[PDB]
RNA sequence: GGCCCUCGAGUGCAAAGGCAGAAGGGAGCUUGACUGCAAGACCCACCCGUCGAGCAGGGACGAAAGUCGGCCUUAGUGAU
RNA sequence: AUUCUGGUGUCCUAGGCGUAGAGGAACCACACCAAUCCAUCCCGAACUUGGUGGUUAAACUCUACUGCGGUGACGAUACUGUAGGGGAGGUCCUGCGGAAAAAUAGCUCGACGCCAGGAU
């Protein structure tokens, strides 16, 4: 189950990162705890990160570690709210190896209506 | 007589003429098999007379 | 819910750790699946039969099986499928401990001649199969109306490893041996 | 007549028999065994011829092993005919043996015997060999 | 066939033909398991004397 | 149904070179098997052949980044 | 500044298996249910959605040994660039220059970069 999903990870990324200028956005997602990270073009450091392991909107959610569509989508606001901070409008939106359906859907629909346009 | 090159007119341009910009219908000539693929092949593609995207009928 | 599966995980859990003394709850040897394998090879030219016979099993449970496709038969047809062969149903869930314990009660007293299930019969790796010569075991079926009589198998599906365990597992869950 | 079972292709080059064979050198069955020093193409009936008359002096007991085998061909072509127009059909099968390697290997007999009877089976072969003495 | 396969600033094309994308010097690097790759890069400065 | 080497399979058609979550096998939607071109190379006695970044228009598929001017590649062909 | 766990590479079998042990404070995974979003060529196995009451057993992570897998010399030897020589028997020998494959000693149970979060 975890073991088939780090090829839906390969497969996507050969091909995405293959093309350069790759401000990628990397949404993660786990049974406890969703993460997302914004990475380089030439792949050495991340330029901004967000999730509900950090210390500022985990003590504003409601939900015990946050795998929901409610947070998702705050996740999604704060995501986009660092990266214009940073300077950055287009990047490359990353589905990491989860199928795009629920709570990654509701990531971009929040990170396309901020600003944030992918 | 077994697969066989055929004439992929217009609909998107049938045959007019006058006002110097003339019309002149386009044309794609490319093969199927006519045992396979019994039915005439109706293809959706460009056509630089239109101007478009035209759906090129099938004819002889 | 069936008698099965309510006094499976109630009193079923902690009884197989302390013949074999396992560290967690959940690698207690126990039923992922069952597959109902029907694998017929005149049912390529006339399948009305096998059409019945997916009813047959799918009126027991309520789950059905999955029209089955032969690997390689003689055909060049490269963009379309080759031969049909038979049926076969994967059971999971509650409808899985349903099928498997009426199984045992309304359909095998109809099984004539039938002393039990052979005990040294498993693969090796804690799984097993029982087969029938008839599909109308089961309680719905009526020898009159049915199309051909066609026989069948059962392969039981468990994540246990030693031989010991899966007799034992039948044995808790309530199967008439053989010696 | 030792001839190889259905091999890969019909017909094949000449080549050449350049260095000395360094793996079939070193004996495995036998005590005493008969080695090449000039390089040849030996057939198989001078294989057979050789086997036969090496047996023929064994006698009382001791064992005798073939350590070489043929596999390649050699063509002849249709007898009294021009040149051209094809290669010919294989006519025998023969084996390039170098310097410095075992074609028979014996045990089992007196020491006495065993040199007696590859006389015979050196005087069978179209190439100068020798005795050796090992295992 | 793909001997060779192609790397960095390097198209490939439907013969798999390996053509430069840019100026520079060719490189031919190691793949991992048991493969070759074609990048190409430009050189910074070439002095004369 | 489980186990074990794992790419010895397959890849419409001879062979060679290739092809792993693939170029192999399945499904959804379609027609880029498209017009206007083309920096630049390979191959060569000539005739011929071959690869093509990219731009222009108008589309396809996708959430997007992108990929598509026939086929995994080399045969399937004739000048005036 | 240092060390962990989660994400991303350079580097691709000195980096992979096996064996032996160890980790749930965090992070990570297995177990609960599924009107609905959505799904099964059948099946909430998988995808998806809603919850948490268990667990470090499996996976994953980390520390060990060389049992395998892998890498691998020096020396020699084959072979060969060039200048010569012997044999009629089909190849061999010499000077000058380059030098394997195999085999073995031995070397390996990764290295190293950035970011997120935790601890000193």
């Known amino acids: 189950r975890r073991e088939d999903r780090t090829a839906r990870h390969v497969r996507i990324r050969k091909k995405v990162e293959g093309t350069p200028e790759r401000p990628r956005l990397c949404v993660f997602r786990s049974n406890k705890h969703l993460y997302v990270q914004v990475i380089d073009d030439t792949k050495m450091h991340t330029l901004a990160a967000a999730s509900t392991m950090q210390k500022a909107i985990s003590e504003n959610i409601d939900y015990s570690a946050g795998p929901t569509v409610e947070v998702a989508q705050k996740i999604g606001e704060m995501i986009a709210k660092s990266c214009l901070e940073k300077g950055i409008t287009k990047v490359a939106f990353d589905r990491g190896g989860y199928p795009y359906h629920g709570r990654v859907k509701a990531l971009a629909d929040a990170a396309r209506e901020h600003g944030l346009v992918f | 007589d077994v697969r066989v090159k055929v004439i992929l007119e217009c609909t998107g341009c049938v045959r007019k003429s006058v006002n110097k910009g003339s019309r002149g219908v386009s044309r794609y000539i490319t093969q199927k098999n006519r045992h396979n693929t019994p039915s005439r092949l109706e293809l959706r593609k460009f056509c630089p007379y239109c101007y478009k995207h035209t759906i090129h009928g099938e004819i002889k | 819910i069936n008698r099965l599966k309510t006094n499976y995980i109630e009193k079923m859990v902690p009884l197989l750790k302390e013949e074999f003394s396992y560290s967690n709850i959940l690698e207690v040897p126990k039923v992922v699946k069952i597959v109902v394998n029907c694998g017929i090879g005149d049912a390529s030219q006339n399948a009305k039969g096998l059409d019945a016979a997916i009813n047959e099993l799918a009126l027991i449970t309520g789950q059905r099986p999955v029209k089955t496709k032969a690997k390689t038969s003689i055909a060049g047809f490269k963009v379309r499928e080759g031969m049909t062969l038979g049926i076969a149903v994967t059971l999971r869930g509650n409808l899985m401990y349903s099928f498997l314990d009426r199984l045992i009660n309304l359909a095998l007293p109809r099984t004539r001649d039938f002393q039990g299930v052979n005990p040294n019969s498993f693969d090796g790796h804690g799984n097993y199969s029982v087969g029938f010569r008839e599909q109308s075991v089961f309680p719905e079926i009526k020898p009159e109306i049915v199309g051909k009589a066609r026989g069948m198998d059962v392969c039981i599906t468990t994540t246990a490893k030693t031989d010991k365990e899966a007799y034992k597992l039948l044995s808790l869950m309530g199967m008439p041996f053989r010696e | 007549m030792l001839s190889p079972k259905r091999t890969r292709f019909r017909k094949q080059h000449r080549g050449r028999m350049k260095g000395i064979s360094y793996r079939g050198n070193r004996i495995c069955f036998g005590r005493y065994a008969l080695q090449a020093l000039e390089p040849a193409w030996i057939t198989s009936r001078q294989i057979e011829a050789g086997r036969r008359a090496m047996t023929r002096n064994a006698r009382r007991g001791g064992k005798i092993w073939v350590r070489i085998f043929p596999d390649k061909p050699v063509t002849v072509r249709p007898a009294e005919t021009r040149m051209g127009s094809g290669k010919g059909s294989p006519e025998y099968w023969v084996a390039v043996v170098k310097p410095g390697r075992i074609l028979y290997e014996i045990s089992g007999v007196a020491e006495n015997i065993a040199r007696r009877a590859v006389a015979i089976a050196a005087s069978k072969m179209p190439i100068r060999t020798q005795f050796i003495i090992s295992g | ?49």
């Open chain 5, 1 to 49: 066939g793909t001997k060779f396969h192609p790397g960095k600033n390097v198209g490939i094309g439907k013969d798999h033909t390996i053509f430069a994308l840019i100026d520079g010097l060719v490189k031919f690097e190691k793949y991992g398991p048991d493969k070759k790759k074609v990048s190409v890069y430009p050189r910074e400065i070439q002095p004369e004397n």
